[PDB]
Amino acid sequence: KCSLTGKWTNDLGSNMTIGAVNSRGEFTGTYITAVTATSNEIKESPLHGTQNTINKRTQPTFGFTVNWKFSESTTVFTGQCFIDRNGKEVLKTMWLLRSSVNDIGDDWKATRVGINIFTRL
Amino acid sequence: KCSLTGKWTNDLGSNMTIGAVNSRGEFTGTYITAVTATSNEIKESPLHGTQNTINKRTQPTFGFTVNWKFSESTTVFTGQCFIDRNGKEVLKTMWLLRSSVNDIGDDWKATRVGINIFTRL
Amino acid sequence: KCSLTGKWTNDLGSNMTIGAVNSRGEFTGTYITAVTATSNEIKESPLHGTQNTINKRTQPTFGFTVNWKFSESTTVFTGQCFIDRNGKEVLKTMWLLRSSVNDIGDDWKATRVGINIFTRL
Amino acid sequence: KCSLTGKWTNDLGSNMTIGAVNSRGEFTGTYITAVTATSNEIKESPLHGTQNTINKRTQPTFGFTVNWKFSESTTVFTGQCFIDRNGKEVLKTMWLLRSSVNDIGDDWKATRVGINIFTRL
Ligand SMILES: *[C@@H]1O[C@H](CO)[C@@H](O[C@@H]2O[C@H](CO)[C@@H](O)[C@H](O)[C@H]2NC(C)=O)[C@H](O)[C@H]1NC(C)=O
Ligand SMILES: *[C@@H]1O[C@H](CO)[C@@H](O[C@@H]2O[C@H](CO)[C@@H](O)[C@H](O)[C@H]2NC(C)=O)[C@H](O)[C@H]1NC(C)=O
Ligand SMILES: *[C@@H]1O[C@H](CO)[C@@H](O[C@@H]2O[C@H](CO)[C@@H](O)[C@H](O)[C@H]2NC(C)=O)[C@H](O)[C@H]1NC(C)=O
Ligand SMILES: *[C@@H]1O[C@H](CO)[C@@H](O[C@@H]2O[C@H](CO)[C@@H](O)[C@H](O)[C@H]2NC(C)=O)[C@H](O)[C@H]1NC(C)=O
Ligand SMILES: CC1(C)CC(NC(=O)CCCCC[C@@H]2SC[C@@H]3NC(=O)N[C@@H]32)CC(C)(C)N1O
Ligand SMILES: CC1(C)CC(NC(=O)CCCCC[C@@H]2SC[C@@H]3NC(=O)N[C@@H]32)CC(C)(C)N1O
Ligand SMILES: CC1(C)CC(NC(=O)CCCCC[C@@H]2SC[C@@H]3NC(=O)N[C@@H]32)CC(C)(C)N1O
Ligand SMILES: CC1(C)CC(NC(=O)CCCCC[C@@H]2SC[C@@H]3NC(=O)N[C@@H]32)CC(C)(C)N1O
């Protein structure tokens, strides 16, 4: 099975624990990033997301928001669960990192984009 | 004030109602998209997200996930609330749309990106 | 007609002059950005791109690279030319801004994404 | 050295040959994609780009446009050359794929985003 519940780790070394997914596809969890651009100490951050429940797909899409507890930014992840050739689950995700800008004129430079690959711990 | 709670509409005509934001910055709501690539009839979809609570910023960043009830995809929004020159609130967001792909080999083509500007209704 | 040749201006106030498009769809030009995150003075920068010519579409897709002459970054634009409801040409583009990072470990944070809308001057 | 000139292959199996980079940082080449969403047979496609020449960086940023000869879309790549721990050259790139849409109302769904990692052949 390819279930979001459990512990995950991505290619950067970030930790991710996801709790039970309810009948509506909602789940919470904690995110421990290995990499930060801030000068603050990294701290465990809550994550909230949902997984698509249409058709009850064996590899449903999902998204979640990480509310960083040491930064003023927000990252959103979206991706899908895959059972690779071997039979091990993989989460392929793309993310957007939103920085805080003091002016709406600086908004053009506030969004970063990137990918992450999560495997089970 | 620039508060996510209330009704919003974006440049595509999509509706968005966000409920109260709790002390942890979590909020739920419903999303009614005006535009769909599916052949299904559009339907109101739940959204879940959080807004950054670090520093009590008057224009905090936020992210939320839309779990489409008529599609098998997931969209994640991230952006910031702005009080423009006049004094009207604006949400500047970028989003990722994740489609469902049956194979991990098709994963490269599953993510769309775009922007939305939300104003109060 | 919706031809890339000529002068353009986007929602940020950036200037853009595109030269003739050759039979292979290649074109050069200059880009004058109104907004910069650097402390350097902005300077006119060359751009190089091509436009798709597969079906001689009235609104072909295109892409080009801006090689900033005052920054160490690179921006790539991709979009399409549209003849809007009125009859005025519009270029709808999305871009990626690549910053220079000293280490491959910092590569995750080096890419920005955003949109631009160009109208004729 | 980390020079764009030569042959490259990415994680999808796509081929890439880049010619000499001139004093202005311009280069051409051909791109052979392993993966296509079209029903057409894949064909070698020209690419045009430039690499940043500011500061004579040993790992300068670059961008290029692929003008697909079998599709009506355009892909733009932007990234940086890295000399990894061992001594291998790696191109870390993000790309935007622009599809052709008949109407400006469909423009919201026309852009895909993704990453590619290129190693020397
Ligand atoms: C992600 O989770 C893994 C699994 O626990 C963490 O790896 C362990 O980290 C501790 C920290 O001292 C080490 O003592 C263990 O030996 C590590 N185990 C393995 C198997 O590597 C990892 O630290 C977590 N990532 C982050 C950023 O906290
Ligand atoms: C977004 O919300 C607005 C505000 O209610 C909707 O606009 C109304 O739509 C109804 C539908 O028949 C019309 O009767 C009203 O005249 C509209 N009011 C205004 C001020 O335009 C709009 O339909 C919503 N968008 C979607 C996609 O449902
Ligand atoms: C983009 O092009 C426009 C058109 O020339 C520029 O607007 C002019 O800028 C000069 C600069 O002093 C003014 O004197 C003119 O009055 C402006 N004309 C209009 C119609 O606004 C604009 O400056 C260019 N953008 C950048 C960033 O250089
Ligand atoms: C990318 O380049 C490599 C290197 O030539 C190609 O790999 C060869 O493909 C031919 C095709 O029949 C095989 O006969 C060789 O055995 C392959 N060599 C290796 C080392 O794998 C590859 O085909 C190219 N990719 C694409 C999409 O054409
Ligand atoms: C603007 C920038 C570059 C980013 C901001 N910093 C942060 O957002 C740190 C919070 C942790 C982000 C972890 C991302 S999230 C996606 C990816 N996947 C993963 O595991 N880690 C990364 C603010 C400052 C100003 C410091 N800097 O400069
Ligand atoms: C693959 C593609 C193109 C997309 C998929 N369709 C959907 O995801 C429809 C669900 C509503 C999305 C609304 C987006 S969300 C961001 C933006 N902002 C806004 O208001 N609307 C848009 C699946 C199919 C196969 C049908 N097609 O083909
Ligand atoms: C990392 C960051 C934020 C960006 C880098 N700066 C630059 O890239 C300036 C070069 C001009 C870019 C213009 C973009 S391009 C797309 C968009 N459309 C438009 O017209 N303008 C904008 C480097 C530094 C470190 C200074 N900062 O910090
Ligand atoms: C809309 C969509 C999904 C895409 C369009 N197809 C193409 O653009 C095929 C041209 C080759 C693209 C190769 C990309 S480029 C970045 C990445 N890196 C790599 O090596 N390959 C991939 C049109 C149609 C309608 C067919 N489909 O549906």
What distance in angstroms lies between residue C15's CA and the mean position of ligand 3's atoms? 8
Burial environment of residue B63 by CB neighbours within 10 A (0 to 12, 13 to 18, 19 or more): buried
- Amino acid identity of residue C104, one-letter, is I
Determine the distance in angstroms separating the CA of D28 from the nearest CA of chain C, rounded to an integer.
11
Give the strand pairing for B61-67 and B89-98.
unpaired
Count of other CB atoms within 10 angstroms of residue B89: 18
Q: Between chains, do C35 and A96 touch, taking CB under 8 Å as contact?
A: no
Burial state string for D75-101 with b = 16 or more CB within 10 A and e = fewer than 16:
bbbbbbbbeeeeeebbbbbbbbbbbbb
Q: How far is A69 from chain D (nearest CA, A)?
A: 28
CA distances for C49 relative to A98, C20, C69, D115, angstroms? 29, 11, 17, 20
Euclidean distance between CA atoms A64 and A95, whole angstroms: 10
Give the span between the Cα atoms of C68 and D78, in whole angstroms: 13
Which distant-in-sequence residues (6+ apart) come within 8 Å of A21 by Cβ?
A: A3, A4, A5, A27, A51
CA distance C99 to D1: 20
Cα torsion angle, C35, C37, C43, C45, sign = negative
Closest residue to C112, CB basis, from A12, A35, A109: A109
Q: Which long-range contacts does D26-33 make (Cβ < 8 Å, 24+ apart)?
A: D26/C48, D26/D50, D27/D51, D27/D64, D29/D64, D31/D66, D33/D68
Residue D25 carries which DSSP code?
S
Q: How far is the CA of A38 from the centre of ligand 5 (A)?
A: 7
Q: For residue A98, what is the nearest residue in chain C, using CA coordinates?
A: C112
A78, A116, C47, C88, D114 from C118: Cα distances, Å: 30, 32, 15, 11, 24
Of C20, C65, C111, C51, nearest to D53 by C-alpha is: C65
Q: Which residues of C touch A37 (CB under 8 A)?
A: 109
Interface test with A, best of C78, C112, C115, C117 (most A CBs within 10 A): C112
Residue C33 alpha carbon to ligand 7 centre in Å: 9
User: What's the alpha-carbon Rg for chain B, to the nearest Å?
Assistant: 15
Show residues of chain D in contact with A115, CB under 8 Å: 114-115
Instruction: Indicate the resolution in Å.
Output: 2.1
d(CA B87, CA B93): 19
Using CA atoms, how far residue D75 sits from A9, A105, A108, in Å, is: 30, 28, 21
* 8 Å CB contact of B78 and A78: no
Q: Rounded to the nearest 5°, which phi and psi values hold at A22?
A: -80, 175
Cα separation, A37 vs C109, in Å, equals 8
- β-partners of residue A95 are A77, A114
Of D85, D66, D51, give the one whose Cα is nearest residue D14. D66
Rounded-to-integer distance, Cα C84 and Cα D103, Å: 9
Contact B9, B118 (CB under 8 A): yes
Q: Which of residues 22-81 of B touch C (CB under 8 A)?
A: none
| Residue owning the nearest CA to atom 5 of ligand 2 | B121
How many other CB atoms are there within 10 angstroms of residue D32's CB atom?
14
Phi, psi at residue A18, to the nearest 5°? Answer: -115, 135
Assess contact for B119 and B12: CB atoms under 8 A: no
As a whole number of angstroms, the distance between CA A113 and CA A96 comes to: 5
Min CA distance, D2 vs chain A (Å)? 23
Bridging pattern class, strands A74-83 and A89-98: antiparallel
Question: Does the CB of C101 have a partner CB in chain A at under 8 Å?
Answer: no
Contact A80, A59 (CB under 8 A): yes
Q: Which of C21, C58, C45 minimizes the C-alpha distance to D67?
A: C21
Whether residue A71 contacts residue A40, with contact meaning beta carbons closer than 8 Å, is answered with yes
CA distance C22 to C99: 31
Work out which ligand 4 atom sits closest to the CA atom of D7: 2
Among protein residues, the one with the nearest Cα to ligand 6's atom 8 is B73
Q: Distance between terminal CA atoms of chain C?
A: 15
- Asked whether A52 and A25 are in contact (CB, 8 A), the reply is yes
Torsion of Cα atoms, D7 then D9 then D13 then D16, to 10°: -40
Residues B92, B118: Cα–Cα separation, whole Å = 7
Best interface-test mutation with D: which of B73, B108, B115 has the largest number of D CBs within 10 A? B108
CB C97 within 8 A of CB C75: yes
Query: Strands B45-51 and C26-32: what pairing?
Result: unpaired
Exposure b/e, A1-28, CB count within 10 A at least 16 = b: ebebeeebbbeeebebbbeebeeebbbb
Do the Cβ atoms of A37 and C109 come within 8 Å? yes
Sign of the four-CA dihedral B56, B58, B64, B69: positive
CA of B113 to the centre of ligand 8 (A): 15
Residues C35, A105: C-beta atoms closer than 8 Å: yes
Question: Which two tokens mark A118?
Answer: 């999560």
**C-alpha span between C89 and B41 (Å, rounded):** 32
Q: Is A12 in the pocket of ligand 1 (CB under 6 A)?
A: no
Residue B74 three-state SS: strand
Tokens 């080449």 locate to D29
**CB within 8 Å: D82 and C55:** no
User: Which ranges of chain D would DSSP assign to H, the alpha helix?
Assistant: none
Q: Which residues contact A22 (CB under 8 A, 6 or more apart)?
A: none
User: What tokens were used for B99?
Assistant: 């489609």
Q: Which residues contact D116 (CB under 8 A, 6 or more apart)?
A: D10, D11, D12, D14, D77, D79, D91, D93, D94, D95
Alpha-carbon span D20 to C83, nearest angstrom: 38
CB count, 10 Å around CB of B3? 15
